[PDB]
Design an enzyme around this catalytic site. Structure first.
Site, PDB file in Angstrom:
ATOM      1  N   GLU A  80       1.025  -1.248  -0.062  1.00  0.00           N
ATOM      2  CA  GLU A  80       0.170   0.015  -0.162  1.00  0.00           C
ATOM      3  C   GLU A  80       0.929   1.045  -0.042  1.00  0.00           C
ATOM      4  OE1 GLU A  80      -4.144  -1.779   0.056  1.00  0.00           O
ATOM      5  OE2 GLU A  80      -2.636  -0.299  -0.990  1.00  0.00           O
ATOM      6  N   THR A  87      -2.620  -9.146  17.328  1.00  0.00           N
ATOM      7  CA  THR A  87      -3.184  -7.852  16.296  1.00  0.00           C
ATOM      8  C   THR A  87      -4.237  -8.449  15.219  1.00  0.00           C
ATOM      9  OG1 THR A  87      -1.518  -7.904  14.594  1.00  0.00           O
ATOM     10  CG2 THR A  87      -1.083  -6.781  16.655  1.00  0.00           C
ATOM     11  N   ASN A 114      10.046   0.348  18.186  1.00  0.00           N
ATOM     12  CA  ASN A 114      11.068   0.381  17.289  1.00  0.00           C
ATOM     13  C   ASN A 114      12.352   1.420  17.374  1.00  0.00           C
ATOM     14  OD1 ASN A 114       8.591  -0.885  15.581  1.00  0.00           O
ATOM     15  ND2 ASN A 114       8.087   1.490  15.358  1.00  0.00           N
ATOM     16  N   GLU A 133      30.467 -14.886  10.872  1.00  0.00           N
ATOM     17  CA  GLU A 133      30.792 -15.724  12.151  1.00  0.00           C
ATOM     18  C   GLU A 133      29.418 -16.456  12.734  1.00  0.00           C
ATOM     19  OE1 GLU A 133      33.823 -14.655  14.920  1.00  0.00           O
ATOM     20  OE2 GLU A 133      34.813 -13.464  13.028  1.00  0.00           O
TER      21      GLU A 133
HETATM   22  N1  LIG Z   1       7.510  -4.217  16.512  1.00  0.00           N
HETATM   23  C1  LIG Z   1       6.518  -3.664  15.604  1.00  0.00           C
HETATM   24  N2  LIG Z   1       5.721  -4.538  15.010  1.00  0.00           N
HETATM   25  C2  LIG Z   1       4.733  -4.038  14.290  1.00  0.00           C
HETATM   26  C3  LIG Z   1       4.399  -2.738  14.289  1.00  0.00           C
HETATM   27  N3  LIG Z   1       3.601  -2.552  13.211  1.00  0.00           N
HETATM   28  C4  LIG Z   1       2.971  -3.719  13.028  1.00  0.00           C
HETATM   29  N4  LIG Z   1       3.734  -4.688  13.389  1.00  0.00           N
HETATM   30  C5  LIG Z   1       3.330  -6.125  13.377  1.00  0.00           C
HETATM   31  O1  LIG Z   1       2.963  -6.502  12.142  1.00  0.00           O
HETATM   32  C6  LIG Z   1       1.994  -7.487  12.297  1.00  0.00           C
HETATM   33  C7  LIG Z   1       1.047  -7.290  11.143  1.00  0.00           C
HETATM   34  O2  LIG Z   1       1.898  -7.090   9.712  1.00  0.00           O
HETATM   35  P1  LIG Z   1       1.915  -5.343   9.420  1.00  0.00           P
HETATM   36  O3  LIG Z   1       3.446  -4.882   9.459  1.00  0.00           O
HETATM   37  O4  LIG Z   1       1.015  -4.665  10.194  1.00  0.00           O
HETATM   38  O5  LIG Z   1       1.431  -5.131   8.018  1.00  0.00           O
HETATM   39  P2  LIG Z   1       2.014  -6.120   6.713  1.00  0.00           P
HETATM   40  O6  LIG Z   1       3.383  -6.643   6.957  1.00  0.00           O
HETATM   41  O7  LIG Z   1       2.029  -5.010   5.721  1.00  0.00           O
HETATM   42  O8  LIG Z   1       0.942  -7.231   6.384  1.00  0.00           O
HETATM   43  P3  LIG Z   1      -0.660  -6.646   5.689  1.00  0.00           P
HETATM   44  O9  LIG Z   1      -1.235  -6.017   6.871  1.00  0.00           O
HETATM   45  O10 LIG Z   1      -1.221  -7.602   5.338  1.00  0.00           O
HETATM   46  O11 LIG Z   1      -0.507  -5.668   4.685  1.00  0.00           O
HETATM   47  C8  LIG Z   1       1.336  -7.253  13.647  1.00  0.00           C
HETATM   48  O12 LIG Z   1       1.273  -8.609  14.118  1.00  0.00           O
HETATM   49  C9  LIG Z   1       2.427  -6.579  14.227  1.00  0.00           C
HETATM   50  O13 LIG Z   1       2.771  -7.475  15.252  1.00  0.00           O
HETATM   51  C10 LIG Z   1       5.416  -2.036  14.717  1.00  0.00           C
HETATM   52  O14 LIG Z   1       5.301  -0.517  14.648  1.00  0.00           O
HETATM   53  N5  LIG Z   1       6.319  -2.382  15.649  1.00  0.00           N
END
Ligand SMILES: Nc1nc2c(ncn2[C@@H]2O[C@H](COP(=O)(O)OP(=O)(O)OP(=O)(O)O)[C@@H](O)[C@H]2O)c(=O)[nH]1
Ligand SMILES: Nc1nc2c(ncn2[C@@H]2O[C@H](COP(=O)(O)OP(=O)(O)OP(=O)(O)O)[C@@H](O)[C@H]2O)c(=O)[nH]1
Ligand SMILES: Nc1nc2c(ncn2[C@@H]2O[C@H](COP(=O)(O)OP(=O)(O)O)[C@@H](O)[C@H]2O)c(=O)[nH]1
Ligand SMILES: Nc1nc2c(ncn2[C@@H]2O[C@H](COP(=O)(O)OP(=O)(O)O)[C@@H](O)[C@H]2O)c(=O)[nH]1
Ligand SMILES: [Mg+2]
Ligand SMILES: [Mg+2]
Lengths: 161, 46, 426, 427, 426, 427
Positions: free
Chosen positions: F61, F169, F218, F244
């Site tokens: 997206e 989530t 993050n 390593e």
């Molecule tokens: N550590 C961390 N994890 C995140 C964050 N945002 C989303 N996630 C993780 O990402 C997972 C979902 O995938 P997203 O990165 O939100 O979205 P995506 O990877 O693009 O996959 P889609 O939603 O299908 O587009 C969730 O289960 C969260 O655990 C973040 O800001 N920090």
């Protein structure tokens, strides 16, 4: 002074029994002795700090009435003072102070325009019209409270400012 | 949206123990009641 | 941290709660407009125990009012601090019981208890760790006694591990409002003896008596009576709200005053109470408070303790006070009148000190006495109940609604066994 | 050398509030946290110009804890050591030992573990508690339980505050004191008894204060603690460590119930009314007009004694005075120890506190004794415990907590064996 | 980049869409003359999802009305923001079906649907990569349902790879306007189960209940109800129009909420909804938000979720909020009321956040929960359908037009296997 | 020495937004892109007076990526590396691995190809992704497959973000995790597991922020990565590169899942609180109070551990600390490794970030270990995967995309085979 009907003396033992005469002034070594006889055990270095805060002079004499107030409860301090007026006259003067303070709170916000209007004019009856026009209700009892204040519109607004 | 706001009783002044009287009720005037303050906008014909 | 919720039942419950909220709001310096204006930060730290911050220091009291007549509700929005309550908590019916325990316990409870249990579930799970709940109600009226009765039972079956306070006024023959006083009071205490954690028994006869003798006011309206019981409530909950040299919470007052789980009715006494003519002539010392706290003319119940034995007692002190004089005065009163104390319990006194005095005063005390003198009143009540029940006066208004006869017999039996065990431990 | 102090209960943390106040003014460290090596036994020098006490306040009512955090020592006590629960055990040993203790003893013991990890030469821990309350008794016992399975061989100085016979603050405090001792007998290594009415007698008589609060109490008790820790905070002419209290004062591993005495407790006007010396204070430290536990030593026989001295002390006058004490007959020792004395000398006088009721003293004595007067005390406790136990008063609270009658009966009979043991060693 | 076209059917749909376009244009700062009057550039980058820049910063709503009576059109043009539509999309018949599903599906659609297909085909070819279509209507009338029905079918068979939303209000026996509501609703849902991607079930009964309790309005005109549902529609599309720390597009929400291809009917809730008087005594926090979210009285359908089991649930949050507070709150509400959730699917809550609140509020939330409680309402209307069909009431007006009985048998059978499979998964 | 960083998914770009922000403020490069040799591993000096990251952002997206394009680093990041799709996979591994991947990963490959051409001494790649999402899983796996067939030999660091058991989530994230593990089983070389719940406990306990957002999360992740790469970024007394980690952390070619932890997680006032030394953090790195994965290493047995240190650390104390850890029995190792530790030290300390919630800390520890707690974690997610799979829930979306039941069945039994491997090596 835990509990008895004679403890105010043991408090009087602090200064006012053993100071023969004069106003509330005590020399620095005498103050140390009058303290250590009661159990304070002050060190001189700390002792001079007391004189620094309570005497910004090289006099070395100390007004103990100002210091013992904080050492004492406001209820028990009167015993040490010995004299406290509970008279009806003193109460009535407190009432007059409260009323005058209240009137000052009322006229304060609009005290500035009142000067411009009075100069636009001064009789008492004319002051009522002026004060009612600016927006404060001026009554006979208000005049009875303000009688010791004036009689002078200039000093009238000045004292209200 | 939107009642009986205040139920009838005497109204003392903010700090002093003095009650508002009819000598203080005028259009434009403002009255302090229970740390609130109300302006008297319009008055009844009676 | 620790949380206390408020519950008010009945007209007397609302007015008592209204004045009580007034006093503690002034205690924490918050205005009738719902904002803080005090000076000492010590007020800020323990306001969560009764309030929740809404919008920029807007603290709504964690309370639930309950009634069946709108005039009560109007009388609540009347005084100061009437517009500091959230109207959603103004849970309120429309029909009205009217001095009918049965209507307050069987018919109107069926459609009101769902709503009140809903809102108290919201008001409880809003905060994390409850300390206990609070209930102010009467034993003469219907919606106060009956509906509060059903409420206490329902919250005890739901949440039994939390503490629970109950302040009830008991009707007296010398101060007699209505006729169905015993038919209500006996049934209600029959539920109190198994449901309530503990109760403070109040009475208006002792209030008028204390007002005439000590206060010597010439027209004691219901207001100052609310002022008295509010001073009680504020005294019992101040130790939680302010640090002290030795603190004591609701739970240890309970564990320290309950030797047996059925004997949870206490008499109360508040000090100092002196007329303004006699305010000027009195000392301010701990024996000066003790002589008025232990005086029998200062209890707020119609039971002379010198007619029986003190099982245990407790005193909560407010103001910067000296501990040695505190416990020595307790030892003194313990030892001089060594007849009025129970034998097999040495050290019949619990005491705690908090360093914050009530506003306008310097040093005060509240008393909570667990004695066997209260079975005087209970016997005085049960004899009126049997006098009516023997010939079935006013019985039809109760029976024709769903109540039956075994409810009366169980109430009488529970009544008789509690006065018996009170006579036993005497 | 390092020794850390944990404080259990409402009383103990107020005690610590006094001791550490006194320690910091003793080592010249301002309440901000910094001075403008001796401190190493109590303070760790974090970073540069910051000394943190080696302490753990713990309580279940957070009001008093947060009062410490909002007091004047906000920065000395670093805000993570002061462990607090959410609600009290409320004078209930059962609620204290089972209900909340299981959630707080873990966090307490892993915190003191990491504190010990900061330590290097730890000699022992010392606990401050009152056996009357619930928090100090219950979770204190459980902490002492899990602390004894953690270390065991390390000394845990238990300075306990017992309820007075005729002076009482609570009602169920006999039950709390019996149940606490029921585990205190096998948990604490060195336990020193501290009643409150004896302190009141001392402040009434020697200090001539008629209306005292707890502060003067805690102040003097802290001066006892500082007096008995002056050997580890400083070097003296005749030093004794913490490990020797098990060797001299405890002949049998269960009779460790020590009475503390301090002299001279003297006001500032009495510092001038009297010309101070050693022998009158050697005599003053023995009478019940100067002990910290309400009892009478004339009815009992002493077991062992520890004499600590601070100030300008020569051992010759002490040796001569102890000679006269051993010739004098007004006090009788037990026939199982020919020498029941052990002295200790420190060069540094005990400092005064601001506004302290005790003046600047040239020499001060802290006495730690053992006798059968504590055996009369426990009999006096057991009598009034059985008084309320006969009718089963307040029992349903502990049962409602989840306990039974077995631990009550076993506590009652364990003290019965305690009295028998005291009557056997007294002969 | 992702596109949504809008399609409104019938009088109710048109007024709903009018309120919808008004509130979204308010959300993006576009005046009723179609010019930019906002402040933040964040409003600019995502208006292509609903607009087309026509002539130098003139934005037209990407919408198509459809109906059969000019009175609807006049009511669209009379109000504000009613002149921003392109008149070429005002596709509109002249005679009227009039609550006749057969007329709205067989006679008038037969010559109206070709043209509307042309205008939607033009509006779909105007953009690059469709995200989904949006259709708003009801299930009681004919003109909105029947033609919108055939419209959905023709779109599915033309573009079967794009998302699709349909907002349908279902009639209730409590709010029962027309007589042939069952004959309409059963046939419409009989088409919705094989054609639409998913549906959002709405009801006026719940709307009236929430403006009684939560809103406490005196005269809830249709404008307010349409304001409610438009806030819902703005809330569900907010993720596309504004960036967030956890984004959830329409396709992502659908694939997360639909476990089986027939289970695509959802009950909706929106927060915060408090009375204007109670707006002052309240706080703005996520548990305050959540407690009004999961309240059964906040659902926009007449199906009590506590009467059944939650299959899945979803929460869309607006405003800069704490994600850790979000999941722990969702963790708690799943752990506490664990019986209401399904067993064989763990972690039954999908949660998302966006950093842009609606204008006028600091924080908002929309709840879309897929429960099994909806079979009650389906059974509620099918028993009425059977009741009328037992002796063929009101049938000849449909029969004489060209429809026959086997369609009705197919509708009830599809409803029956529907409800039985809810009971199976319940 | 160069290494390339790619970011796959909504989580990856925000994580990289933290990382590169940290890197430029570490190397003194203003966001405009220029400086007012160590950067040569992450930055190429574009033209002269400008530095480009060796980075590839990729999503389906546009909203998050063009938010970066309108952010503050519009010039630092250069406008052709930020590859963007047109519509999301939407939590659908099938759509992400087969539908949209076939048009997007080709461009990604041919972009990183010329990036690798620009590079000279490629150490490896590192990918950022959360296996819960669709985009991070599907096209990420497809890209890793084509990257393995491209290079195969070069190290590819998979820093994955797992879904927490109780904190969730998404809904179909078990399906996504299973399908993604079936590919990263044999594609990535060295892969680090990072949960969210342990991070949430960290910010609750140590950082003590009550209401955190993903930014602080993050921030610490980026600090973990920076601590892992400062070995090649700057010279230390003992530096270790990316190569390593295969010979020290990978005993078996299919068990490449490392548990990460960091120390010390210290707030601004707590740096004033605690005196930082190395022994305490060395302990702190092993307790679950500082791990990045919600698991119990007490239920686990460690196989291999890495310990990167930054700041002012002399090796004598880390040898003394590992010696005391090895003779301590609170953590038990596997019987097949006699020495299971590997240390490392770099001179430069981890810096503070503007607005970040960390303090100026003198030294830091990054722990990368391996255990069988993951062996528990896999079972925990395998079971809950089997729950929803038993009734064919949400399967119709993947088959509607074009997948079948075979890959579900084979990945299920393969993860089963993963468990039997874990239980066999654990003994
Ligand atoms: N550590 C961390 N994890 C995140 C964050 N945002 C989303 N996630 C993780 O990402 C997972 C979902 O995938 P997203 O990165 O939100 O979205 P995506 O990877 O693009 O996959 P889609 O939603 O299908 O587009 C969730 O289960 C969260 O655990 C973040 O800001 N920090
Ligand atoms: N010497 C001394 N004893 C104290 C002091 N404060 C309380 N105590 C004693 O402690 C006993 C009760 O225990 P507390 O410390 O007050 O409270 P607690 O130990 O936390 O137990 P709970 O009240 O249940 O929470 C009382 O009987 C007092 O004798 C004090 O300041 N000095
Ligand atoms: N102390 C006190 N008692 C009251 C008050 N109002 C009523 N009562 C007592 O309560 C009893 C009647 O209670 P009632 O008004 O019928 O309660 P309700 O019907 O449940 O609301 C009478 O015995 C009164 O003496 C009050 O304001 N203060
Ligand atoms: N939400 C909403 N529903 C409405 C409105 N007006 C009518 N309805 C509903 O629509 C149903 C009748 O449908 P109808 O108006 O004949 O559909 P149409 O003729 O195609 O527009 C009634 O049961 C109403 O509940 C409105 O303004 N808002
Ligand atoms: Mg306590
Ligand atoms: Mg995503």
């Amino acid at each position: 002074l835990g509990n008895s009907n004679n403890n105010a003396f043991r408090m009087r033992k602090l200064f006012k029994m053993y100071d023969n005469d004069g106003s509330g002034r005590v020399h620095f070594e005498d103050f140390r002795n009058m303290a250590e006889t009661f159990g304070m055990q002050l060190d001189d270095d700390s002792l001079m700090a007391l004189y620094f805060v309570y005497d910004p002079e090289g006099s070395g004499y100390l007004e103990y009435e100002a210091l013992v107030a904080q050492l004492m409860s406001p209820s028990d301090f009167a015993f040490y003072k010995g004299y406290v007026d509970y008279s009806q006259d003193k109460a009535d003067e407190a009432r007059r102070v409260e009323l005058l303070s209240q009137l000052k709170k009322k006229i304060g916000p609009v005290a500035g325009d009142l000067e411009r209007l009075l100069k636009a004019f001064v009789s008492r009856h004319d002051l009522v019209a002026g004060c009612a026009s600016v927006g404060v209700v001026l009554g006979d009892k208000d005049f009875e409270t303000l009688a010791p204040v004036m009689t002078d519109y200039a000093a009238f607004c000045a004292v209200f400012n | 949206t939107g009642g009986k706001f205040l139920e009838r009783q005497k109204i003392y002044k903010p700090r002093s123990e003095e009650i508002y009287t009819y000598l203080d009720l005028y259009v434009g005037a403002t009255i302090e009641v229970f740390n609130r303050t109300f302006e008297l906008l319009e008055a009844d014909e009676y | 941290m620790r949380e206390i919720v408020h519950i008010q039942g009945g007209q007397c419950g609302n007015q008592i709660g209204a004045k009580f909220w007034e006093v503690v709001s002034d205690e924490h310096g918050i205005d009738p407009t719902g904002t803080y204006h005090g000076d000492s930060d010590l007020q800020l730290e323990r306001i969560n125990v009764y309030f929740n911050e809404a919008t920029g220091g807007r603290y709504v009291p964690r309370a639930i009012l309950m009634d069946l007549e709108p005039g009560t509700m109007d009388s609540v929005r009347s005084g100061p601090y009437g517009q500091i309550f959230r109207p959603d908590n103004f849970v309120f019916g429309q029909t009205g019981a009217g001095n009918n325990w049965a209507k307050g316990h069987y018919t109107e409870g069926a459609e009101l208890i769902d709503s009140v249990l809903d809102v108290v579930r919201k008001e409880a799970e809003s905060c994390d760790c409850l300390q206990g709940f609070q209930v102010c109600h009467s034993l003469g009226g219907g919606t106060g006694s009956g509906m509060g009765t059903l409420l206490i039972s329902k919250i005890r079956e739901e949440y039994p591990d939390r503490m629970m306070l109950t302040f009830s006024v008991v009707p007296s023959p010398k101060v007699s409002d209505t006729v169905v006083e015993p038919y209500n009071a006996t049934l209600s205490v029959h539920q109190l003896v198994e449901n309530a954690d503990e109760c403070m028994v109040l009475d208006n006869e002792a209030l008028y008596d204390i007002c005439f003798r000590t206060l010597k006011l010439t027209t004691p309206t219901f207001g100052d009576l609310n002022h008295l019981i509010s001073a009680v409530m504020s005294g019992i909950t101040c130790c939680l709200r302010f640090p002290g040299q030795l603190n004591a919470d609701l739970r240890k007052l309970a564990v320290n005053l309950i030797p047996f789980p059925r004997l949870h009715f206490f008499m109360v006494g508040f000090t100092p109470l002196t007329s303004r003519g006699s305010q000027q002539y009195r000392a301010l010392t701990v024996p000066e408070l003790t002589q008025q706290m232990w005086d029998a003319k200062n209890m707020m119940c119609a039971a002379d303790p010198r007619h029986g034995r003190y099982l245990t007692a407790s005193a909560l002190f407010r103001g910067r006070m000296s501990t040695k004089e505190v416990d020595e005065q307790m030892l003194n009163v313990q030892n001089k009148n060594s007849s009025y104390f129970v034998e097999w319990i040495p050290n019949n006194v619990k005491s705690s000190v908090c360093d914050i005095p009530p506003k306008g005063l310097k040093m005060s005390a509240t008393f909570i006495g667990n004695s066997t003198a209260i079975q005087e009143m209970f016997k005085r009540v049960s004899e009126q109940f049997t006098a009516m029940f023997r010939r079935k006066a006013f019985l039809h208004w109760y029976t024709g609604e769903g109540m039956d006869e075994m409810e009366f017999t169980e109430a009488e039996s529970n009544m008789n066994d509690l006065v018996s065990e009170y006579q036993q431990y005497q | 050398r390092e020794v850390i102090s944990i404080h259990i209960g409402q009383a103990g943390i107020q005690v610590g509030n006094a001791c550490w106040e006194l320690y910091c003014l003793e080592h010249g460290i301002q309440p901000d946290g910094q001075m403008p090596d001796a401190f190493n036994t109590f303070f760790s020098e974090t970073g540069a110009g910051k000394h943190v006490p080696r302490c753990i306040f713990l309580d279940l009512e957070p009001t008093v804890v947060d009062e410490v955090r909002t007091g004047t020592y906000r920065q000395l006590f670093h805000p993570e050591q002061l462990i607090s629960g959410k609600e009290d055990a409320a004078n209930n040993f059962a609620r204290g030992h089972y209900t909340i203790g299981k959630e707080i003893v873990d966090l307490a013991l892993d915190r003191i573990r990491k504190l010990a990890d900061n330590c290097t030469g730890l000699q022992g821990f010392l606990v401050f508690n009152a056996v009357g309350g619930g928090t100090g008794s219950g979770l204190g016992s459980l902490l002492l339980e899990r602390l004894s399975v953690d270390y065991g061989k390390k000394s845990k100085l238990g300075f306990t505050v017992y309820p007075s016979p005729q002076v009482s603050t609570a009602v169920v405090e006999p039950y709390n004191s019996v149940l606490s001792t029921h585990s205190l007998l096998e948990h604490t290594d060195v336990a020193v008894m501290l009643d409150n009415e004896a302190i009141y007698d001392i402040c009434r008589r020697s200090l001539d204060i008629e209306r005292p609060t707890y502060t003067n109490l805690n102040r003097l008790i802290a001066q006892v603690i500082s007096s008995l820790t002056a050997s580890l905070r400083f070097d003296g002419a005749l030093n004794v460590d913490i490990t020797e209290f098990q060797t001299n004062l405890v002949p049998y591993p269960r009779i460790h119930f020590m009475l503390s005495s301090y002299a001279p407790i003297i006001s500032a006007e009495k510092a001038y009314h009297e010309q101070l010396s050693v022998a009158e204070i050697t005599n003053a430290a023995f009478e019940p007009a100067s002990m910290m536990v309400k009892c009478d030593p004339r009815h009992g026989k002493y077991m062992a004694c520890c004499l600590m001295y601070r100030g300008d002390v020569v051992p010759k006058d002490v040796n001569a005075s102890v000679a006269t004490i051993k010739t004098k007959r007004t006090i009788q020792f037990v026939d199982w120890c020919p020498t029941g004395f052990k002295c200790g000398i420190n060069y540094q006088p005990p400092t005064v506190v601001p506004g302290g009721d005790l003046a600047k003293v040239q020499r001060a004595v802290c006495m730690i004794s053992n006798s059968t007067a504590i055996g009369e005390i426990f009999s006096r406790l057991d009598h009034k415990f059985d008084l309320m136990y006969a009718k089963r008063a307040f029992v349903h609270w502990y049962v409602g907590e989840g306990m039974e009658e077995g631990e009550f009966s076993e506590a009652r009979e364990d003290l019965a064996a305690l009295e028998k043991d005291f009557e056997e060693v007294g002969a």
